[PDB]
Each structure stands twice: as structure tokens, then as C-alpha cells.
């Protein structure tokens, strides 16, 4: 069930996993949802993606304090756009360790964003070098190649059926790939399929802006990306 907390929505997806949802009223597009994850592991919480704003991200922290009451060990963000990185300063104000793709931390200031404190590096084949992602527990992090943005990264949650492509992936009903302003049109299709190949056992694909979808979301996305080349 959708749990309301100030202006945000939280939905439990699995015993240790919640989706956080924040909204931006965007003229001509309506109220736009943005989703991230909250993962409980041991006696701590891990956050995937900020909300659109610092104020909303602070509300994520207030919800975690009230409903879970365990420390937030770290946050990782999936790309340097406002919907996923717009609340980075709220995390730093709360003393949370933050992580992003090295490329995201390089891009962040020009994107009007605050960089994460820690940079991730990726093996040639896209899996995060674990030494750059300490204490990530069940959070498995994978750079699929450039797509929605050059810096986009993806996460799977070990011990669940859940993976999250962020804005790389569109749901199975999408009428476009959306914002291609920062997209790599050459590599998009390959990166979407690489995400599917990295997390072959994931049946619940958490969507960046809509309800969770099946693996049809990944195939629909790569098929739309094929038309970009
Ligand atoms: C969720 C969503 C996005 C965000 P993303 O870049 O991650 O795909 C989006 C982006 C650009 C355009 Br142009 C339309 C979009 N739409 C459709 C609009 C919302 C309803 C009217 C069209 C999205 O839903
Ligand atoms: C940066 C940006 C986002 C965030 P992301 O691309 O990460 O989803 C966005 C998201 C939803 C909608 Br609906 C429009 C959006 N717009 C404006 C549209 C982009 C193409 C024309 C307008 C964003 O700029
Ligand atoms: Zn984006
Ligand atoms: Zn998006």
C-alpha cells in the first residue's frame, strides 16, 4: 500500500525494500513522480537516489527515522539529473556518506547539482569495483554503458527479485524514451540490453517514474533505443 508522508509516498516492495516517490509540478506535463529505493540491511538503511529537491530528500530521512529508526549508512545516486541527485545537500547536512559514478561527480556542478563525496569506478565489463563501494551489502551496482545519460548506473538487490534501471529504462507502455537531451543515441540500445543481462533473475523492474513493471519494460526500452541509431 502507498504510505503518505508529507508530500512523498513510500511503498514497501519486499521485507527489506521500499520505493520512495517525490513529485515536481511541471507546466505542460502535470505532477511528475520520481522513484528511488530504501533498503534495510543488518541494522542500517541504504538509499538509492535523492528526491527532486533538498526539502523532499530531508522528508525521506524523516520517514526513515519515524518508520524504521535505523541509521542511513550511505546513499548512491543513479545519474546527475535533478530527479535523482537534486537533494544531495540534504544527505550531506544529515552526515550521510554519498556515492555516485565518478562521471556523475564530474558532471554534477555543471548540472547545478552537488557532487557525491565518493566516486565509484567500474570494471571494463560494467560491474562496480567493490573496493569503491564498501558496505553496499545487497546493493549490486552496474554501469551498463551510456544511454539516458553518459553517467547512468543501475542497481540490483541481492536476496530479492528487484532491479532498478532508473531513467535508462521506460515502462512497457511508454510512448517514447522521454528526455534525450543528454542521451547517447549510438549506445542506448546496447546499454538497456546490458542492464537486462546484468540482472537476469530480476522479475520486478522498479521504474524511475511509474509503478514497478516486468522485464517487458527492458525489451520495450531497447526496441525504442534501436530506432535512435
Ligand atoms: C516520466 C516521463 C519523462 C522522464 P524520462 O526522461 O526519465 O523519460 C519524460 C521526459 C521527457 C518527456 Br518529452 C516526456 C516524459 N514523460 C511523458 C510526459 C508525461 C506525461 C505527458 C508526456 C514521462 O512520463
Ligand atoms: C531533466 C528533465 C527530467 C528529469 P529525467 O530526464 O532524469 O527524467 C524530466 C523528467 C520528467 C519530465 Br515529464 C520532463 C523532464 N524534463 C523536461 C523535458 C526534457 C525534454 C523536454 C522537456 C527534463 O529536462
Ligand atoms: Zn535524467
Ligand atoms: Zn527520468
UniProtKB/Swiss-Prot annotation:
Binding-site residues for Zn(2+) 1, renumbered to this chain: 79, 81, 148
Chief localisation class: periplasm
Regulation of protein activity: Inhibits by captopril, thiorphan, dimercaprol and tiopronin. This enzyme is not susceptible to inactivation by the beta-lactamase-blocking agents clavulanic acid.
TM region(s), chain numbering: none
Gene Ontology molecular function terms on file: beta-lactamase activity; zinc ion binding
Subcellular location: Periplasm
Cofactor note: Binds 2 Zn(2+) ions per subunit.
Binding site for Zn(2+) 2: 83, 167, 209
Record keywords: Antibiotic resistance, Hydrolase, Metal-binding, Periplasm, Plasmid, Signal, Zinc
Enzyme Commission designation: 3.5.2.6
Positions contributing to substrate binding: 170, 179
Cofactor: Zn(2+)
Family: Belongs to the metallo-beta-lactamase superfamily. Class-B beta-lactamase family.
Described function: Confers resistance to the different beta-lactams antibiotics (penicillin, cephalosporin and carbapenem) via the hydrolysis of the beta-lactam ring. Does not confer resistance to the polymixin colistin or the fluoroquinolone ciprofloxacin.
Other observations noted: Enterobacteriaceae carrying this gene (identified by PCR) have been isolated in Sweden, India, Pakistan, Bangladesh, England, Scotland, Northern Ireland, Australia and the USA. The organisms they were identified in were K.pneumoniae, Enterobacter cloacae, E.coli, Proteus spp, Citrobacter freundii, Morganella morganii, Providencia spp and Klebsille oxytoca. In India most isolates were from community-acquired infections rather than hospital-acquired infections, indicating the gene is widespread in the environment.
Protein's UniProt name: Metallo-beta-lactamase type 2
Primary gene name: blaNDM-1
Amino acid at each position: 500500500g502507498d504510505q503518505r508522508f508529507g508530500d512523498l509516498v513510500f511503498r514497501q516492495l519486499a521485507p527489506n525494500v521500499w520505493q520512495h516517490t517525490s513529485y515536481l509540478d511541471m507546466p505542460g506535463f502535470g505532477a511528475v513522480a520520481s522513484n528511488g529505493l530504501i533498503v534495510r540491511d543488518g541494522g542500517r538503511v541504504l538509499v538509492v537516489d535523492t528526491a527532486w529537491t533538498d526539502d523532499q530528500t530531508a522528508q525521506i530521512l524523516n520517514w526513515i527515522k519515524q518508520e524504521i529508526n535505523l541509521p542511513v549508512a550511505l546513499a548512491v545516486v543513479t545519474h546527475a539529473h535533478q530527479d535523482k541527485m537534486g537533494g544531495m545537500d540534504a544527505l550531506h547536512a544529515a552526515g550521510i556518506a554519498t556515492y555516485a559514478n565518478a562521471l556523475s561527480n564530474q558532471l554534477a556542478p555543471q548540472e547545478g547539482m552537488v557532487a557525491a563525496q565518493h566516486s565509484l569506478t567500474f570494471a571494463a565489463n560494467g560491474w562496480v569495483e567493490p573496493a569503491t563501494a564498501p558496505n553496499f551489502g545487497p546493493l549490486k551496482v552496474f554501469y551498463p554503458g551510456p544511454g539516458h545519460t553518459s553517467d547512468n548506473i543501475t542497481v540490483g538487490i541481492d536476496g530479492t527479485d528487484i532491479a532498478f534501471g532508473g531513467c535508462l529504462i521506460k515502462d512497457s507502455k511508454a510512448k517514447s524514451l522521454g528526455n534525450l537531451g543528454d542521451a547517447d543515441t549510438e549506445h542506448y540500445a546496447a546499454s538497456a540490453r546490458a542492464f537486462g543481462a546484468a540482472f537476469p533473475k530480476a522479475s520486478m523492474i522498479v521504474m524511475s517514474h511509474s509503478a514497478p513493471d516486468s522485464r517487458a519494460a527492458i525489451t520495450h526500452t531497447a526496441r525504442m533505443a534501436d530506432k535512435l541509431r
